[PDB]
Ligand binder design. Structure first.
Ligand SMILES: [Mg+2]
Ligand SMILES: [Mg+2]
Ligand SMILES: [Mg+2]
Lengths: 233, 222, 204, 195, 125, 212, 196, 226, 195, 196
């Protein structure tokens, strides 16, 4: 049992016709103090998987090292390490899900919520969630922390059920993700303007976008707001 | 302080017929007031014509089902591919559950199948492993909404034959698979209306001598 | 410890074609101990019926209170109180004890004498009105009652059909609750006749 | 205090109440009468927290005696019981509530019927053929459910009461030092001095 | 509250309101009390100007204060009810605290004390 | 819950109710509170459902191993002590049991041992365990004799559960009867309390407080 | 909150962010924390929104009634009315208020009223959760008798840093200028102050 | 509960869902959360349902008396001031969370109130358990100079987000439009996207199914003549 | 369990122990023997937490019986008591301590003297002329202090014991259902079947 | 504590106050919080003195043994050894350490290790109770590739403000300069830095 110290906020993601998108801001909070402004919370594994992590940053760095070691280990005595016997998103998730549930069962959890996004060998989209309790679930859209409350409602308007996935293009999906990140910046007190976004497509592969910013913000209407009720000036 | 347990909601229902058995459950997964997934399968085919569902805390539920599926596998290795009977599976699950008596799987488990005479069978477990064979059993969030309805419409409780006025009970006539599914659907439709954690979808697994079949039905998504 | 489930009991009300029905069990207990099988929970002031679940002392107190108030109402108004008006009186009376409430779950049922329209309503312990078209439930087996009513109910039932529906709703709900049962009563209410029926049920 | 029983038969009400008074470690008295006569044909037994029991019982007694003098008329058992209930129902939401349970046995001279009312400290009233408070019902109700008839004589009621007390003396851990038994009928209230 | 001193002394040392209260007693129907060797009897007059009266329900002139003490009066009928009520309450209060009924002298002393209090209290006659 | 067991001339009667509750919610009316340890030994179920089920079927395995090794039926004294010694090892861990281990052997005769999760092991003639135990004791104590017939003893056990089922909110559903002889136990059926109550009321003249 | 008031040559300027919080959820991103209790006596609010709104409304009522009887009140008088409420109800309030005003006789004045209910007259004042991160910056960069443009830059830069580090602060930077010339409202958006 | 308020060109609109709950159980499937303070001042309530109506009717009653006393149509700032001072006095114990909207001779207004009496001003607001789902939609689609038709669309879309995504909210959408120089139009059940499907079976019983012990006529009439 | 007494007279030791066993609400048994024979001339009574009492008593019994077989010799009461004390003194600092109080009555065949040892669950041993555990001493010691003589006969010891039990039955709130009395002397251990 | 490490053109400089606290009592006013784990790898200590001393002693032992086998360790390596202890014993430690070192290949590097046990490589770092008050100042005044004299002034001014506002910080300002030229110790007394 511990308490999280340096923490990372929402991770958001969704499926589209040819793959999956995932995003997370670059902030490491220390309580209310916005302490670390250059933290990467999306960690790619190979060219077909991206693991997005929220929660305790020290535990995130541990998980990051486990995944790095996992790639090394898979390559040992494996001539097909970069082909048929490469790491799949489903392999990487199940491994993490095992660790998370084992750690909660020893009453010493990795204080995180994790979303594994990727594309399988046969082209199928993979998107699944796991947290400090070892709870897992899948859905066309997935989000952690605040994202669950604010991002999912917006992303579900694009892909509401399974049959909406083939009808959703990568342009429409990325647009929806970027808009969700803006909304989170408006409303989450532990979020930042800077974020990273990753696309995993069955045709064009893994595109990793760093140093993105929330733009096209509406603030002008603030000038007309005066007082809290009766004040006119 | 760290709390190792959570509640993923959900509701499940097992009914045993004359020569069949059904195990149903909604596909909604939740925490507090949020929806995690509108379709997260909760009832599983475990092989040997046995279906299983462990409702409650999904991490413990998934762990248990995974371990039982494993137990079926090793039963085949160790005992010359012998079919695991539903009664044997039930006793095995008790030992899996009681193994963690002092740090329990926070789930209410139900399995369904056919017994060794070909008749329908359902077994029900508590979190620590006590189990009963039963004819009709709902579990989870909306269990209290469903069971009274089943008592009335399956077992014909409090129903007497017109004209006699309480003297003659309504006879317990056997229900077909089509008739049972109607009652399952109406149970979940009613539960969906009045319980916030129930909705999205209904998945039913039917078990006969021919094997395991699936049926899916939409539920209200609010 | 929890005041609303010391004594136990349930009430249910339904609407039909030109009629309403209200029903309750007869149990009073001290937690596990069954004390009385003749504790009726449905009262009436003129043609307006009131069922009350929850802590029994408050059930008795509120009945005496509304009898008091509806009697003074009748003397001054020179007419019997109507269900819609009475509902507002219950709501007012409960909310005046906002921070020291009666631990009850009242249910109003009746037919408006002028319009002939069937009416039912429910309240939480603090006064909030739930005025449903179909049915109202209350008590320690409210969950069970919601399950029965939601499946068994259909609109525009004739008085004698409505009797069977509400009776089966109560009985099967009560049998799945430890603190309810020990007998039951059903009121069938029409514009100018009311029939009261005691039901035969298991006594455990 | 501990055990108080009541049974209504054909033509009378019988109340039985324990004699022991315990101050934690020791039994200070073994002859205590846990009852008060409210009117010539109405008796009230009681049990609850120390001090509050007698204080309440005597307060009720004074009020009923006051009513009797003012109107030159004895209130019905039903009327007395309702008054008692209201006082307890008032008490439960007070600063410091009366922690007192009571049984009211009376003979209604108008209707020529015996009546037994059970009221707990919350103000929960029920009319019964037989009643009790505390754990007393847990031991005795299975016997009363079996043997009780509405047309029992007073002597049959006392015999059924003896069977109840015997079961209490066998299975209860506490020694309540026997019971004082009183009968309420058309002729008034009297004590059974050998029990 | 109304505080006016209605009962006051006059130059000749009389309290007229108390004396006029006695004139009201003079007007009232006659009452008599006689004690024997082992009994007391209270006699009372009923003026026969009022017939068509219902004697079953009409307030009787003699009133029980307790089971062992009685009170009769002459003067204002409405006023007597207030003294009788106070006396009846005090009788039960004495039984409750002293565990013994009032003596006739004690009950008299109480009622007389109430009467006196109303001769030097503000706002009352 | 209400479970009882008493010794008499013809052996042992075991009678139980069938209700299981989670708070006020009635989970089951068809629970089996008599564990069939083997063809000669019975155990009752009160307190923890799993604890009683798990450890009394385990007890049956130990009794089977005993008679394989010793070529002789295990005594009720020895069988009860295997269970009591086991739960005593777990004392403090939070086990919940209140059971009667019932049997009939040559050397002992009809024997009943009350076994408790806090280690208690008592031999006795009449035992009654559960939330409705006090109600059942009343009927038992006032009607019990050693020289009861098998028919009358079976009824006494049935009637005592009914007394509890009626008054105790957490007891009911149905009554399960058993008669334990030297040659083994004999099952005497499941009896719905709803139907049994009215039947007994009419035939016996009891429960005049209840309208029927 | 991040709030501050700064006296300068021509009078005084009040500054504030616009974020209101219930936990990590930003309940209002465009809040007006600069509040008017009199024509040229304003205040900055931090702590419980309910408490500071209730207090500010009462003070406005007191100063309106003061004005009807005794003419325009001093800034010191306004601060005393604030103090009286905050001190006498310290057990039931969570309010940190900065009072700023402009007289012609006294010119620009600033009074800070922390939790306890004490009063402190200062050349400039900072308060709110975000103020902790700019004690160093403000102490090094404050000068007396600054110009209007310098003071606006000082407040803009200061609150910019407070917003950058404090999660509880954010949104637009509101300002209110109090001089002989009158009352001027200013607003500065994220795209402006973040790049500073 | 999900409730929203949206300003537009010539007025203001408020909306709400119609689900009220007792823990995880739905007490009423078609609850009315849009309350009237005065003819052209309406508010939506979340939190303790008894408190939101009680506090609305008390202030509404006093607002009516005030309107009669002053011979003037009531103002929203009057309702706001009276509500906040009442709620502050009770220190949050009266669990009323309100969105107050209306039109008056001053113009159109939109405020929110919290249980502790804290208020705020805005062009778009949301309250309740589904406020985050609703606010996400409002932050995505709100703009300045909305028309009446656009505002109703945005408001109901925000409530829908609450209905579908928040378990505390459900069933129908209620709307109330308050435009300047016009009567306020209360649109009860403006959307009905949650009708229950026909059941597989009828559960009407044969007459005489229920066992009966006694029957009797209840005397509801008064004492009769002759 | 509840009351256990002991008294050492001229030529014997007498132990008295209650018969009741209570499971909270009900009295499950009224004939329970709270004692074990450790050796032919040594008896141990006990009282404490349920389960632990018998488990401990039987464990001690087995160990003393084992010693008797190994050496073909009976340990002295003093030797047995010291062994018992050490086991309890060991127990008190364990993970889960035995919550058991005991009295050890024995007749030393070497010294031809009766001996009574009182040991509580902490391992506190004292040799006494008369002893008790729990609240039993509070009621009985004032009588024993007055009447006790070292040269009492066994019959006089039993009479003084009856007076002690009578006082317990009068002033104790709990009904302990009488006592089983056992005598330890040169001829061994026997039970007084009428008391 | 107020501690900081700053990289500059020629290497890196560590800075610290000298106050150690047990409550309001200053248990040591001349403490040395700049500690050596290797020739040109030092650290700044904040939090529990016992914990940070125990950790620093273990790290020094590890790096001494590393040196005997594999030659001079990197600053990254030193930070990893610190992290391994802080992360794996997070439940039982209260330590906030800044690691600073000079390689010839990598030049000046700074790693900050907060409570959780996470590692963050930064151009400069601040920590300790007094750091909260200078986040604004340091962010506005830090530049990359400063000179030695500029960096000393930056640290001196920064810790001066931290000391001014934080009661837990005080005493002398110690500094340690790490460059190719070697290891230089600096000290600055109150009379010097207070008047800044
Ligand atoms: Mg639903
Ligand atoms: Mg029952
Ligand atoms: Mg910020």
């Amino acid at each position: 049992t511990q308490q999280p110290i340096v923490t990372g906020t929402s991770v958001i993601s969704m499926k589209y016709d040819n793959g999956v998108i995932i995003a997370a801001d670059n902030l490491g909070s220390y309580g209310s103090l916005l302490r670390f402004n250059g933290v990467e919370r999306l960690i790619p594994v190979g060219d077909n998987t991206v693991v997005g992590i929220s929660g305790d940053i020290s535990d995130m760095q541990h998980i990051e090292r486990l995944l790095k070691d996992l790639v090394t280990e898979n390559a040992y005595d494996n001539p097909l390490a970069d082909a048929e016997e490469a790491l799949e998103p489903s392999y990487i998730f199940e491994y993490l899900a095992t660790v998370m549930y084992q750690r909660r069962s020893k009453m010493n959890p990795l204080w995180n919520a994790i979303i594994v996004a990727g594309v399988q060998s046969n082209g199928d989209q993979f998107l699944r969630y796991v947290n400090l309790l070892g709870v897992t679930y899948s859905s066309p859209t997935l989000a952690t922390g605040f994202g669950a409350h604010m991002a999912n409602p917006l992303l579900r308007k694009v892909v509401d059920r399974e049959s909406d996935i083939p009808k959703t293009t990568v342009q429409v999906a990325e647009e929806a993700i970027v808009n969700a990140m803006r909304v989170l910046y408006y409303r989450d007190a532990r979020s930042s303007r800077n974020f990273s976004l990753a696309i995993i497509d069955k045709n064009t592969g893994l595109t990793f976008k760093k140093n993105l910013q929330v733009e096209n913000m509406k603030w002008d209407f603030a000038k007309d707001i005066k007082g809290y009720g009766t004040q006119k000036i | 302080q760290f709390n190792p347990y959570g509640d993923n909601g959900g509701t499940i229902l097992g009914i045993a017929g004359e020569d069949f058995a059904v195990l149903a459950g909604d596909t909604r997964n939740i925490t507090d007031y949020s929806i995690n997934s509108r379709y997260e399968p909760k009832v599983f085919d475990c092989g040997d014509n046995i279906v299983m569902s462990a409702n409650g805390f999904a991490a413990d539920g998934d762990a248990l089902v995974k371990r039982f599926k494993n137990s079926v596998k090793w039963y085949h290795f160790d005992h010359n591919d012998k079919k695991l009977s539903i009664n044997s599976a039930a006793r095995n699950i008790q030992h899996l559950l009681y193994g963690k008596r002092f740090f329990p799987y926070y789930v209410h488990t139900i399995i369904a199948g056919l017994d060794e005479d070909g008749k329908g069978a359902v077994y029900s477990f508590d979190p620590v492993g006590s189990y009963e064979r039963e004819q009709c059993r709902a579990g989870g969030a909306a269990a209290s909404l469903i069971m009274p309805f089943l008592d009335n419409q399956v077992n014909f409780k409090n129903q007497y034959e017109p004209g006699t006025n309480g003297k003659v009970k309504k006879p317990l006539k056997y229900l077909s698979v089509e008739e049972v599914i109607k009652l399952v659907r109406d149970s979940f439709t009613s539960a969906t209306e009045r319980h916030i954690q129930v909705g999205d979808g209904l998945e039913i697994l039917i078990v006969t001598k021919d094997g395991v079949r699936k049926e899916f039905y939409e539920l209200k998504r609010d | 410890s929890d005041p609303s489930s010391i004594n136990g009991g349930i009430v249910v009300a339904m609407t039909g074609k030109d009629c309403v029905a209200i029903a309750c069990d007869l149990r009073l207990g001290s937690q596990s101990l069954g004390v009385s099988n003749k504790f009726e929970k449905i009262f009436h002031y003129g043609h307006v019926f009131l069922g009350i679940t929850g802590l029994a002392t408050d059930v008795t107190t509120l009945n005496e209170m509304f009898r008091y108030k509806t009697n003074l109402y009748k003397l001054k108004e020179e007419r019997a109180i109507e269900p819609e008006t009475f509902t507002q009186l219950v709501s007012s009376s409960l909310y005046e004890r906002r921070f020291g409430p009666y631990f009850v779950g009242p249910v109003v049922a009746g037919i408006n004498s002028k319009s002939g329209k069937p009416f039912i309503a429910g309240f939480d312990l603090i006064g909030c009105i739930d005025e449903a078209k179909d049915f109202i439930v209350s008590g320690t087996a409210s969950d069970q009652l919601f399950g029965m009513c939601e499946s068994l109910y259909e609109p525009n039932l004739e008085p004698e059909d409505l009797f069977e529906t509400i009776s089966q709703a109560l009985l099967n709900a009560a049998d799945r609750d430890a603190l309810s049962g020990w007998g039951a009563v059903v009121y069938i209410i029409k514009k100018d006749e009311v029939v009261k029926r005691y039901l035969k049920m298991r006594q455990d | 205090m501990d055990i108080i029983l009541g049974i209504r038969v054909q033509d009378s009400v019988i109340l039985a109440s324990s004699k022991a008074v315990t101050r934690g470690i020791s039994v200070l008295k073994d002859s205590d009468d846990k009852t008060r006569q409210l009117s010539p044909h109405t008796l009230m037994s009681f049990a609850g927290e120390a001090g509050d029991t007698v204080q309440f019982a005597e307060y009720i007694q004074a009020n009923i005696q006051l009513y009797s003098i003012r109107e030159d008329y004895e209130l019905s058992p039903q009327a007395v019981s309702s008054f008692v209930r209201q006082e307890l129902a008032k008490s439960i939401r007070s600063r410091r509530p009366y922690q007192v349970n009571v049984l009211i046995g009376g003979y209604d001279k108008k209707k020529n019927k015996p009546e037994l009312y059970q009221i707990d400290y919350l103000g929960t009233k029920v009319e019964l053929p037989y009643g009790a408070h505390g754990y007393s019902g847990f031991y005795t109700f299975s016997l009363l459910d079996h043997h009780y008839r509405p047309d029992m004589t007073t002597e049959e009621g006392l015999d059924l009461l003896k069977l109840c007390v015997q079961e209490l003396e066998k299975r209860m851990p506490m020694d309540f030092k026997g019971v004082i038994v009183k009968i309420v009928d058309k002729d008034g209230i009297r004590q059974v001095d050998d029990f | 509250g109304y505080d006016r001193a209605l009962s006051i002394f006059s130059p000749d040392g009389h309290i007229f309101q108390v004396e006029y209260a006695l004139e009201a007693v003079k007007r009232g129907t006659c009452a008599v009390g006689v004690k024997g060797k082992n009994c007391v009897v209270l006699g009372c007059e009923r003026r026969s100007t009022l017939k068509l009266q219902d004697t079953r329900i009409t307030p009787s002139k003699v009133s029980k204060i307790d089971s062992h003490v009685v009170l009769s009066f002459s003067g204002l009928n409405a006023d007597s009810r207030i003294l009788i009520e106070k006396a009846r309450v005090e009788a039960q209060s004495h039984r409750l605290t002293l565990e013994d009924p009032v003596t006739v002298e004690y009950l008299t002393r109480y009622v007389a004390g109430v009467q006196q209090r109303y001769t030097q209290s503000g706002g009352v006659r | 819950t209400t479970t009882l067991a008493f010794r008499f001339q013809g052996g042992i009667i075991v009678a139980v109710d069938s209700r299981a509750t989670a708070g006020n919610w009635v989970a089951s009316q068809t629970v089996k509170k008599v564990i069939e340890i083997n063809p000669f030994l019975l155990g009752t179920m009160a307190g923890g459902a799993a604890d009683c089920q798990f450890w009394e079927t385990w007890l049956g395995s130990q009794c089977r191993l005993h008679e394989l090794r010793e070529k002789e039926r295990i005594s009720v004294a020895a069988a009860s002590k295997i269970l009591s010694n086991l739960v005593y090892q777990y004392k403090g861990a939070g086990l919940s049991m209140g059971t009667m281990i019932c049997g009939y052997t040559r050397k002992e005769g009809p024997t009943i041992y009350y076994v408790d999760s806090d280690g208690t092991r008592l031999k006795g003639d009449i035992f009654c365990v559960g939330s409705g135990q006090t109600f059942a004791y009343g009927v038992l104590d006032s009607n019990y004799k050693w020289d009861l017939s098998v028919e009358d003893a079976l009824y006494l056990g049935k009637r005592s559960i009914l007394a509890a089922a009626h008054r105790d909110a957490y007891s009911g559903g149905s009554v399960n009867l058993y008669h334990v002889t030297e040659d083994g136990w004999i099952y005497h059926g499941n009896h719905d309390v709803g139907e049994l109550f009215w039947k007994v009321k009419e035939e016996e003249g009891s429960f005049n407080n209840v309208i029927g | 909150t991040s709030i501050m008031a700064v006296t300068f040559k021509d009078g005084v300027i009040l500054g504030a962010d616009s974020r209101t919080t219930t936990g990590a959820y930003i309940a209002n991103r465009v809040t007006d924390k600069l509040t008017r209790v009199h024509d040229k006596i304003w205040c900055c609010r931090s702590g419980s929104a309910a408490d500071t709104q209730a207090i500010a409304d009462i003070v406005q009522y007191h100063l309106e009634l003061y004005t009807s009887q005794y003419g325009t009140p001093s800034t010191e008088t306004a601060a005393s009315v604030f103090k009286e409420l905050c001190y006498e109800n310290k057990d039931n309030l969570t309010a940190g208020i900065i009072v700023a005003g402009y007289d012609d006789k006294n010119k620009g004045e600033v009074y800070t009223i922390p939790l306890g209910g004490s009063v402190h007259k200062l050349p400039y004042a900072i308060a709110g959760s975000g103020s902790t991160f700019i004690y160093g910056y403000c102490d090094k960069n404050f000068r007396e008798n600054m110009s209007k443009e310098e003071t606006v830059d000082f407040i803009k830069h200061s609150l910019s840093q407070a917003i950058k580090w404090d999660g509880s602060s954010g949104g637009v930077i509101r300002m209110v200028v109090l001089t002989a010339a009158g009352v001027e409202r200013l607003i500065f958006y994220p795209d402006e102050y973040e790049q500073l | 509960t999900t409730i929203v308020g949206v300003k537009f060109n010539n007025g203001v609109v408020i909306a709400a869902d119609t689900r009220s709950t007792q823990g995880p159980i739905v007490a009423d499937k078609n609850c009315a959360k849009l309350h009237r303070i005065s003819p052209k001042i309406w508010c939506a309530g979340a939190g303790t349902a008894a408190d939101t109506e009680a506090v609305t009717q008390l202030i509404g009653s006093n607002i009516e008396l005030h309107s009669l006393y002053t011979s003037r149509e009531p103002r929203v700032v009057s309702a706001l001031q009276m509500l906040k001072q009442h709620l502050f006095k009770y220190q949050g114990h009266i669990g009323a969370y309100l969105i107050v909207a209306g039109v008056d001779p001053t113009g159109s207004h939109l405020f929110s109130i919290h249980a502790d009496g804290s208020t705020d001003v805005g062009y778009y607001l949301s309250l309740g358990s589904g406020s985050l789902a609703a606010m996400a939609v409002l932050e995505s689609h709100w703009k300045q100079d909305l028309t009446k038709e656009e505002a109703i669309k945005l408001a109901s879309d925000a409530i829908q987000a609450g209905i579908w995504n928040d378990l505390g909210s459900g069933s129908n959408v209620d709307v109330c439009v308050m435009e300047i120089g016009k009567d306020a139009e209360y649109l009860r059940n403006y959307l009905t996207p949650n009708v229950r499907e026909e059941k597989q079976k009828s559960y009407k019983f044969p007459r005489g199914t229920t066992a009966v012990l006694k029957e009797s006529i209840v005397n509801i009439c008064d004492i009769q003549e002759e």
